[PDB]
Design a protein around this nucleic acid. Sequence first.
DNA 1: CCTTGGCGGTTAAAACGCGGGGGACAGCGCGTACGTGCGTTTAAGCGGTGCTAGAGCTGTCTACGACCAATTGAGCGGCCTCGGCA
Length: 107
Amino acid sequence: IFIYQNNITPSANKMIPTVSPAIIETFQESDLVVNITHHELVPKHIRLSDGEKSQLLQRYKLKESQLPRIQREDPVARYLGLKRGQVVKIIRRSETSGRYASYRICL
DNA sequence: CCTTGGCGGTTAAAACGCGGGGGACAGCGCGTACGTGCGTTTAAGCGGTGCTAGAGCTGTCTACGACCAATTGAGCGGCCTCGGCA
């Protein structure tokens, strides 16, 4: 996890995916002053394991490409270091049923 | 929502000042072997007929290989067949 101070030049931004299978995640120091997951409007995200994911897809008989999506640069996906193909489970408050579990898959 | 007018951001290296430290430029000392103007005597050099002929200069003659014109054969590229490595 690489925290920088002011900016990251676009030329230097191409040096990040060239260092695989190790993963590098960059963050601007401003963006971390507040932990956004403590906000009222952000419900608790929990990444599903590979076994739980497979069990989920069979229950709904669905292709991976049919789930709702979250972009990789989304703030909560970056916070969790989500990689392509991984699913988050989102349990959020509902005024009609009380509790409701929503699933999203990361692009 | 998309593509130009001028503007930061994008590298290999030199715009090298300038800190360090020494190879080596030009003047100066000494110092020796070689070095030309003048001197001698010479052996070849410049200019003249005398003699004798080789082949250039210029002339016309006789002549054999190329020009541009119709034939036509071999090398090469595009189809088309044959064949063993994967």
